[PDB]
Amino acid sequence: TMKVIDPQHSDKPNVLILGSGWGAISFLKHIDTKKYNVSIISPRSYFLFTPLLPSAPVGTVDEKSIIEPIVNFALKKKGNVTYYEAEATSINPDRNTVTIKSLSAVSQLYQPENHLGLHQAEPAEIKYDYLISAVGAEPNTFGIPGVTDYGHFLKEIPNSLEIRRTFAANLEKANLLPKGDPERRRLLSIVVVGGGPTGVEAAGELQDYVHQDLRKFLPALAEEVQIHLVEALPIVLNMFEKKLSSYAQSHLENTSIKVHLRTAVAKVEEKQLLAKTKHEDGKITEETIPYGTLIWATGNKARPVITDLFKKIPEQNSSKRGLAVNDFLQVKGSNNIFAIGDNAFAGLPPTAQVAHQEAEYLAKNFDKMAQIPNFQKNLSSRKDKIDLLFEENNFKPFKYNDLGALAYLGSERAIATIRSGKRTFYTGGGLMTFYLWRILYLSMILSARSRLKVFFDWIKLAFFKRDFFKGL
Amino acid sequence: TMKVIDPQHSDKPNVLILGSGWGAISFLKHIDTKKYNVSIISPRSYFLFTPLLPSAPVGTVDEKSIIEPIVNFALKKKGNVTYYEAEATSINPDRNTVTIKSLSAVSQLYQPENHLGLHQAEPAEIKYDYLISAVGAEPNTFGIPGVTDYGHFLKEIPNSLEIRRTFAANLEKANLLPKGDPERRRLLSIVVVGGGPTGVEAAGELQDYVHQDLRKFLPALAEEVQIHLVEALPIVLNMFEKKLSSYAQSHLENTSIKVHLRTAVAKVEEKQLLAKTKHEDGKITEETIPYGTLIWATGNKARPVITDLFKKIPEQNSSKRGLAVNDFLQVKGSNNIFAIGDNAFAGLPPTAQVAHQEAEYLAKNFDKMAQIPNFQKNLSSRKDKIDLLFEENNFKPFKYNDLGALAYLGSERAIATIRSGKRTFYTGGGLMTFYLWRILYLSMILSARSRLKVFFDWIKLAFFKRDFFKGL
Ligand SMILES: Cc1cc2nc3c(=O)[nH]c(=O)nc-3n(C[C@H](O)[C@H](O)[C@H](O)COP(=O)(O)OP(=O)(O)OC[C@H]3O[C@@H](n4cnc5c(N)ncnc54)[C@H](O)[C@@H]3O)c2cc1C
Ligand SMILES: Cc1cc2nc3c(=O)[nH]c(=O)nc-3n(C[C@H](O)[C@H](O)[C@H](O)COP(=O)(O)OP(=O)(O)OC[C@H]3O[C@@H](n4cnc5c(N)ncnc54)[C@H](O)[C@@H]3O)c2cc1C
Ligand SMILES: NC(=O)C1=CN([C@@H]2O[C@H](COP(=O)(O)OP(=O)(O)OC[C@H]3O[C@@H](n4cnc5c(N)ncnc54)[C@H](O)[C@@H]3O)[C@@H](O)[C@H]2O)C=CC1
Ligand SMILES: NC(=O)C1=CN([C@@H]2O[C@H](COP(=O)(O)OP(=O)(O)OC[C@H]3O[C@@H](n4cnc5c(N)ncnc54)[C@H](O)[C@@H]3O)[C@@H](O)[C@H]2O)C=CC1
Ligand SMILES: [Mg+2]
Ligand SMILES: [Mg+2]
Ligand SMILES: [Mg+2]
Ligand SMILES: [Mg+2]
Ligand SMILES: [Mg+2]
Ligand SMILES: [Mg+2]
């Protein structure tokens, strides 16, 4: 009753990739398609360059500029790549299969295709020799009531649209109200929850729009908007040196953002939220904050398809943040499942930088496995010896090299620490750091198209106001 | 019970503009805001550069590139401009008022604003000294059944989005079906009704996408798409010389578009439509054409707010296509209403070219009226003498100067006839004509921002495939 897709007209092993983000796409770019048959399953038909996402809701860059269709990467590959636009709902380790639903499309980027006989919204299972799981993670509310109903995450392209639509609508209503009206004040207030670089960059970009663009035509309205950054810890950007945090904070306050440190949002309602401050002496105070737009940026948690998999594998039952993997990024308790990026946990920070390095490491290992006939064989055997094969052939374990971190702060200021190994090549903040931020980001974009478009967005920004359309 | 906005803290006359299109915006650009107070009512907060609309559904240019916010033009003005984002529902000539509904926003681009006390979705009446009606026209179905339910117009930005979403969705379903499936064939078929430059350019742009971009990754699918152009007359592009029509048609057919001349769509159903051919000898044949995407481009008709006004003015009861105006673009039967663009009819073709010339002419006349105290006065008087005042001060009547016409045909070919007076400076077709088409269109764009963005779209097109996202 359940269709099974199992391509056996090739001697090449079938590598199945879950996702189309940093892990999946970086892997796709490096994997040898002459040696392997690659399929990809993802509900999102494009790669998202997440570091510029915070700059999309206000039109600093356009949404289209920071995404790139999977097919464009796949076209660069010499062999057979297939992309299933669908969601993996169940990983089935013992039969080597992935169950997919919400299938919208299947693209076989190779001349003599085989008709698969799939139908939209018809469930199916896709058979693999090797599985690479990179479905990332999903926004964490920490069980705080109301965040899902009344706030916006900042995680995917639709969030950027949603945020713009909410704020634009609020600006229109507010401007019809007389100055000093408390409801007007509420509609013009934005709360960003989470003082990591995502929340900070989101807050800075909104303040940029308000101060540079909105001010040009509705200056009274612009002057009344109030952005709040709410952070539970005693400092923002706690992954940087404290002096950079301290710079960032003063800068944000200087651009008129209100920064609430040692403060947690305890509850969210439709038009107000409850924030609690734990002061340095142990005393707790409370504040009710009326808000028009709520952006929630407090980190992520494992997706259901992954938590479900925790249960199916004895070695993973104690897993919580993500799949536990060995030195070779092999899922523990599994012979042929690998996991990279945010859906795997090995103590490293959940960043694009880690995902990208994992992917490139994993793809090199696949180059080597293709030179050792035995890896091919153990798939057929009933004994799982692949982890043994790694040590026995002296594959080096994955070693992460932290290259540093960057954060834009609004008003043409950024902080940046650039590293490699024990060496620091750059660490500071300011105007020049902002130009460095731009240049480095441009460098890290995965495609020429997206790189050109972001570059064009920035040039237009030199001369003209940001596009800020409610329905576009 | 109905609020009335009536600004009388100035001695300047209140000029009210309906629309934000070719007529309205061109007028706005030339009207003297030192002599007049200008308000604008339009449900669309941006100007649309219509000649590039056919090239938006497939991402040849982006939707954002060809629109420009009204506020951007208004900011260039020295005096007081106010923009009501709302729809005029009733023109009330005897009380000099316009009734508005669906109010979303009001923007007063001047420092000391007066709180108007308006509310969203609260009806209001806006009082004028002078009314300039430029609300354009709306798509005509000629009463053919089903066109509204099952087809798409190509008239406004949302149409471009709808068309993209339909075709993209069809491409996905079709590709899941085996080659030769008749349903697959249907899903890959597009019918464009109307052989004017709008239908032709739409067809050519779609064929461009299919041949240049889709073919790169799904060549089997691309090869099966079939675009149909259906035109009731015996030639396409009948406003051009027959030899250019003849060149266009051969070119279209050469790019694989099927052109059905002497053929009219008589009925439209969800998955098929009925087309009837009246042959040169008088014989009528019929064909049922299955289709996946239907684009309906057969010209326009008067909007309800305008037809309603026909009834309120004795001199306009016989009006059908639009408001009847005199030599000075004054609505007949009215002392202080003027009409330009497609909502007025004076025998001239309904084009942007005519609308733009009318607007600039009308604005010059307003410069002159401001030097003749009497125009100001007749507003107060009960006798309507403004039309007399025009002749008596020897204002010249409006004289249209046809500058020619242009049409893109797909695959880097265009036709173009450039005129002025009796002189023809250019008339022909081909590759160079296509480069001319681009350069002239860039020249005609009303703002630097939009012009830069279109220019960047074309450059990116030189290197990369068109963006064709279903949900963006
Ligand atoms: C706003 C923002 C800014 C960021 N900035 C930085 C930064 O500046 N520097 C940095 O180092 N990191 C940054 N990050 C973090 C970085 O984006 C993540 O660590 C990175 O995405 C992890 O890569 P991933 O492949 O594991 O997940 P992702 O890149 O999120 O990709 C996951 C993929 O899986 C797909 N998927 C989801 N569910 C399923 C399913 N059930 N079946 C199949 N596929 C599925 C998704 O659609 C997506 O295609 C930022 C994150 C955000 C949200
Ligand atoms: C796809 C396409 C391509 C075209 N290409 C060309 C070309 O290449 N060359 C050429 O010369 N002409 C071209 N035209 C024709 C040209 O666009 C029209 O003749 C022109 O729009 C007429 O100008 P207008 O101001 O009367 O109407 P529009 O420019 O359409 O403006 C009407 C305005 O009124 C607003 N409005 C609608 N209803 C109301 C309401 N009730 N109250 C207040 N405002 C309202 C609309 O939102 C819009 O802003 C093209 C048209 C289309 C659709
Ligand atoms: N923008 C960027 O450059 C980067 C962003 N990231 C993102 O950061 C995440 C990893 O860091 P995390 O610490 O998980 O998130 P984070 O780094 O975005 O910071 C979240 C912050 O929100 C605060 N917070 C949590 N609950 C709160 C509440 N109820 N009220 C107020 N504040 C609250 C926490 O103190 C925490 O510091 C990843 O999921 C990734 O998406 C990761 C790398 C880089
Ligand atoms: N794209 C461009 O360059 C320009 C386009 N226009 C548009 O042209 C319109 C004015 O010219 P029109 O002749 O009214 O429209 P049109 O010039 O766009 O062409 C419509 C054509 O469709 C055909 N048609 C009508 N009903 C049909 C049916 N049931 N089946 C098949 N064919 C049918 C007609 O013969 C007509 O030639 C305006 O609405 C304006 O928007 C105007 C100026 C320039
Ligand atoms: Mg398995
Ligand atoms: Mg939501
Ligand atoms: Mg809200
Ligand atoms: Mg006045
Ligand atoms: Mg329709
Ligand atoms: Mg064809």
Side-chain angles (χ1 to χ4, degrees):
Chain A
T1 59
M2 168 88 68
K3 194 165 256 283
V4 174
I5 306 310
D6 192 359
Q8 287 303 335
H9 24 263
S10 200
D11 50 334
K12 315 194 196 183
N14 296 327
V15 179
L16 183 59
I17 301 175
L18 308 186
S20 49
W22 279 103
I25 297 301
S26 298
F27 183 77
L28 174 58
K29 284 162 69 74
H30 284 99
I31 186 68
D32 193 349
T33 50
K34 293 173 246 57
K35 300 290 183 199
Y36 299 98
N37 283 56
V38 177
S39 290
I40 305 149
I41 298 166
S42 179
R44 187 181 83 192
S45 66
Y46 55 82
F47 163 77
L48 169 61
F49 184 69
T50 49
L52 282 180
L53 186 58
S55 83
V58 295
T60 298
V61 302
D62 187 75
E63 283 85 3
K64 287 188 188 65
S65 301
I66 64 174
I67 67 181
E68 182 75 49
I70 295 169
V71 157
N72 293 353
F73 298 97
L75 277 174
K76 264 59 172 303
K77 309 301 295 199
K78 308 201 192 78
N80 293 352
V81 181
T82 303
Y83 165 53
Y84 303 87
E85 181 173 344
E87 178 179 345
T89 57
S90 179
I91 297 174
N92 310 121
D94 296 322
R95 55 182 183 276
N96 293 343
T97 238
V98 175
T99 306
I100 64 182
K101 301 192 185 184
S102 308
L103 173 73
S104 315
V106 181
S107 306
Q108 295 171 103
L109 291 329
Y110 50 96
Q111 294 177 335
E113 304 171 0
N114 21 273
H115 185 253
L116 298 177
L118 298 165
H119 315 105
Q120 288 182 329
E122 178 215 38
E125 296 193 0
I126 315 291
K127 204 82 154 185
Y128 58 86
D129 295 318
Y130 295 117
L131 182 57
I132 319 290
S133 181
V135 304
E138 69 166 84
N140 195 356
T141 68
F142 294 101
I144 308 295
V147 9
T148 292
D149 291 327
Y150 302 127
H152 297 290
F153 299 125
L154 186 48
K155 185 73 168 48
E156 300 281 357
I157 291 291
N159 298 148
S160 176
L161 283 6
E162 294 162 11
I163 293 168
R164 172 157 65 259
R165 190 169 292 126
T166 294
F167 188 45
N170 287 354
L171 289 171
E172 292 174 351
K173 288 198 223 76
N175 197 45
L176 289 179
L177 263 6
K179 292 170 197 173
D181 193 292
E183 175 69 356
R184 167 165 161 133
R185 222 158 57 234
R186 179 184 73 86
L187 293 165
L188 293 179
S189 81
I190 303 168
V191 175
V192 182
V193 178
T198 298
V200 163
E201 287 171 322
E205 287 283 353
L206 285 153
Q207 192 58 69
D208 276 357
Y209 170 75
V210 165
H211 178 258
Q212 305 175 9
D213 296 346
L214 180 61
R215 197 170 52 91
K216 299 304 181 53
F217 54 96
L218 258 11
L221 201 69
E223 197 54 33
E224 300 187 52
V225 352
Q226 184 56 65
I227 297 161
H228 303 259
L229 216 212
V230 182
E231 164 59 47
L233 294 175
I235 75 295
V236 303
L237 306 171
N238 70 337
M239 73 291 313
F240 294 79
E241 304 128 16
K242 281 180 191 285
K243 54 175 178 287
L244 290 177
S245 291
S246 183
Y247 171 89
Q249 188 187 339
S250 296
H251 173 69
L252 295 167
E253 286 163 346
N254 186 246
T255 63
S256 85
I257 291 166
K258 185 189 216 307
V259 177
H260 306 236
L261 302 169
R262 298 180 184 275
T263 311
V265 170
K267 192 198 183 189
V268 177
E269 288 159 319
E270 188 191 332
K271 297 178 178 192
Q272 55 184 23
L273 53 79
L274 176 61
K276 291 173 151 161
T277 304
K278 184 186 295 162
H279 305 261
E280 198 176 357
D281 55 30
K283 288 164 192 169
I284 293 186
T285 52
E286 269 183 23
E287 177 180 0
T288 286
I289 309 177
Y291 73 87
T293 313
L294 167 63
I295 297 162
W296 192 271
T298 64
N300 309 294
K301 70 182 174 172
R303 298 193 196 270
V305 67
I306 295 300
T307 52
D308 291 356
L309 182 59
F310 289 165
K311 308 164 171 304
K312 296 166 182 187
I313 312 185
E315 293 79 346
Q316 296 292 330
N317 292 21
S318 46
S319 294
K320 321 175 200 304
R321 286 179 181 119
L323 287 163
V325 291
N326 67 17
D327 286 349
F328 309 99
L329 308 183
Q330 191 179 346
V331 167
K332 285 175 176 172
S334 156
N335 190 53
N336 62 349
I337 310 182
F338 303 78
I340 61 187
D342 295 350
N343 76 179
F345 184 74
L348 302 176
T351 70
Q353 206 185 114
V354 172
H356 173 86
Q357 275 180 43
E358 280 168 337
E360 196 185 334
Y361 163 84
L362 195 52
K364 304 297 180 62
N365 280 13
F366 272 67
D367 287 327
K368 294 172 192 175
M369 297 154 70
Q371 296 294 300
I372 301 173
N374 308 96
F375 277 100
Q376 252 282 43
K377 312 179 196 312
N378 185 252
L379 280 2
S380 70
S381 164
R382 105 181 58 87
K383 180 166 291 209
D384 300 337
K385 305 177 84 71
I386 294 201
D387 59 343
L388 273 63
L389 260 0
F390 282 129
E391 291 174 315
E392 289 175 356
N393 294 260
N394 308 288
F395 278 71
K396 307 140 196 175
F398 172 60
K399 215 287 165 44
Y400 176 53
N401 181 24
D402 188 329
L403 272 22
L406 303 115
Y408 177 59
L409 309 174
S411 306
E412 295 79 67
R413 301 296 179 265
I415 55 178
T417 295
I418 312 314
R419 291 181 275 264
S420 186
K422 293 163 192 175
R423 299 217 277 164
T424 298
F425 301 82
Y426 189 106
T427 175
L431 172 60
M432 204 55 50
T433 310
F434 159 70
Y435 291 110
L436 184 66
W437 178 92
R438 284 195 156 180
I439 295 176
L440 266 21
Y441 273 19
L442 272 186
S443 292
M444 279 142 40
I445 288 171
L446 290 190
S447 53
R449 174 188 148 282
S450 179
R451 177 157 40 243
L452 181 57
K453 291 170 65 61
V454 165
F455 177 71
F456 285 170
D457 284 341
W458 285 343
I459 290 179
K460 134 147 166 304
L461 195 59
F463 299 102
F464 304 109
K465 302 191 288 304
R466 289 164 184 80
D467 293 334
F468 194 66
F469 303 96
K470 199 177 162 186
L472 224 50
Chain B
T1 60
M2 167 89 67
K3 193 165 256 283
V4 176
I5 306 309
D6 192 358
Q8 287 303 336
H9 24 262
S10 202
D11 49 332
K12 313 194 199 182
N14 296 326
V15 178
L16 186 57
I17 304 174
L18 308 187
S20 47
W22 278 105
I25 299 298
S26 301
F27 184 78
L28 176 56
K29 284 160 67 73
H30 285 98
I31 185 68
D32 194 347
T33 54
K34 293 172 245 57
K35 302 293 180 194
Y36 297 99
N37 285 39
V38 177
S39 289
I40 302 150
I41 296 162
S42 179
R44 187 182 82 195
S45 67
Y46 56 81
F47 163 76
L48 168 60
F49 187 68
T50 52
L52 284 177
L53 185 58
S55 86
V58 299
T60 298
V61 301
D62 184 76
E63 283 82 3
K64 292 185 186 65
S65 299
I66 64 172
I67 66 183
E68 182 73 49
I70 296 169
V71 156
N72 291 356
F73 298 97
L75 277 173
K76 266 57 175 300
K77 308 302 299 197
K78 308 201 191 78
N80 291 352
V81 185
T82 302
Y83 163 51
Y84 304 85
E85 182 175 341
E87 174 183 345
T89 59
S90 180
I91 296 172
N92 311 121
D94 295 319
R95 57 180 182 276
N96 294 340
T97 238
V98 175
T99 305
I100 65 181
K101 299 190 188 186
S102 308
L103 174 70
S104 309
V106 179
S107 308
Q108 294 171 104
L109 291 331
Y110 50 95
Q111 294 177 335
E113 304 172 359
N114 21 274
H115 184 254
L116 296 177
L118 296 165
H119 316 105
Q120 289 181 328
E122 178 215 37
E125 294 196 2
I126 315 291
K127 203 85 157 183
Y128 58 87
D129 291 319
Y130 297 113
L131 182 60
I132 320 292
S133 185
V135 302
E138 70 168 82
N140 196 357
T141 66
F142 294 101
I144 311 293
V147 8
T148 289
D149 291 324
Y150 301 130
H152 296 290
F153 300 122
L154 184 51
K155 184 73 164 51
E156 298 286 347
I157 291 294
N159 298 150
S160 171
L161 280 10
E162 295 160 9
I163 292 166
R164 172 156 66 259
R165 191 172 290 124
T166 293
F167 188 42
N170 288 353
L171 285 171
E172 290 173 353
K173 291 197 221 77
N175 193 46
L176 289 176
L177 259 10
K179 293 169 197 174
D181 191 289
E183 173 68 353
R184 167 167 159 137
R185 224 159 56 231
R186 179 185 71 83
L187 291 166
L188 292 177
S189 79
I190 303 169
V191 177
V192 182
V193 178
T198 296
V200 165
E201 289 171 322
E205 289 283 353
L206 283 155
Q207 191 61 66
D208 277 354
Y209 169 75
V210 168
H211 180 257
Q212 304 177 10
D213 298 341
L214 179 64
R215 197 171 52 90
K216 300 303 181 56
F217 54 94
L218 262 7
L221 203 68
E223 198 54 35
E224 302 186 51
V225 353
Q226 182 60 61
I227 297 161
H228 302 259
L229 220 211
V230 178
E231 164 60 45
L233 294 176
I235 75 298
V236 304
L237 306 171
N238 69 321
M239 71 295 308
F240 293 82
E241 303 129 15
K242 280 179 192 285
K243 60 178 175 289
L244 292 176
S245 292
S246 181
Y247 171 89
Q249 188 187 338
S250 294
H251 173 68
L252 292 171
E253 284 165 346
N254 186 242
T255 59
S256 80
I257 291 166
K258 186 190 215 307
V259 175
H260 306 235
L261 301 170
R262 299 178 184 273
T263 311
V265 168
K267 190 198 185 188
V268 178
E269 287 161 319
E270 191 192 330
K271 297 178 177 194
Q272 57 183 22
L273 52 80
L274 174 61
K276 294 175 153 162
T277 305
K278 180 185 298 163
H279 304 260
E280 199 176 356
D281 55 31
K283 287 164 193 169
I284 294 191
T285 49
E286 274 184 22
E287 176 181 357
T288 284
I289 311 178
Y291 73 86
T293 312
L294 166 67
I295 295 164
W296 190 272
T298 63
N300 309 294
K301 68 181 175 174
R303 299 188 192 274
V305 63
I306 295 303
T307 53
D308 292 353
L309 182 59
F310 289 167
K311 307 166 171 303
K312 296 168 182 190
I313 310 181
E315 292 80 343
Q316 301 289 333
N317 291 21
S318 47
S319 294
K320 323 175 199 303
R321 286 197 255 249
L323 290 163
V325 294
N326 67 15
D327 287 350
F328 309 100
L329 308 184
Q330 192 178 345
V331 170
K332 290 174 175 171
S334 156
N335 191 54
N336 62 345
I337 311 181
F338 304 79
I340 61 186
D342 294 349
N343 74 182
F345 184 73
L348 302 177
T351 69
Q353 209 183 112
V354 169
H356 173 87
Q357 281 182 39
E358 284 167 335
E360 198 184 335
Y361 164 86
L362 197 51
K364 302 298 181 61
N365 281 12
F366 272 67
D367 287 325
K368 297 174 191 174
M369 295 153 69
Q371 297 294 299
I372 302 174
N374 308 97
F375 277 100
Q376 251 282 44
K377 312 179 196 315
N378 184 252
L379 281 2
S380 72
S381 164
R382 105 181 57 88
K383 180 165 290 209
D384 300 337
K385 305 177 84 71
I386 293 198
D387 59 343
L388 273 64
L389 260 359
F390 282 129
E391 290 174 315
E392 290 174 356
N393 293 262
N394 309 289
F395 278 72
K396 304 143 201 178
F398 170 62
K399 214 288 164 43
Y400 175 53
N401 182 23
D402 189 333
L403 273 20
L406 301 116
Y408 178 59
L409 308 174
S411 303
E412 294 80 67
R413 301 296 180 264
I415 57 182
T417 299
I418 311 313
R419 293 181 273 260
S420 184
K422 295 164 189 175
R423 299 218 277 165
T424 299
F425 301 82
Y426 189 107
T427 174
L431 172 60
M432 202 54 51
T433 307
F434 160 71
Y435 292 109
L436 183 66
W437 177 94
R438 291 194 152 181
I439 294 173
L440 264 21
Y441 275 19
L442 276 184
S443 295
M444 277 142 42
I445 287 173
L446 293 187
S447 54
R449 175 189 145 285
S450 179
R451 177 162 37 240
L452 183 59
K453 287 171 69 63
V454 164
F455 180 70
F456 283 169
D457 284 343
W458 284 342
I459 293 179
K460 134 150 164 303
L461 196 56
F463 300 102
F464 304 109
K465 303 189 289 302
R466 290 165 184 83
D467 293 330
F468 192 68
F469 303 97
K470 198 177 167 188
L472 223 50

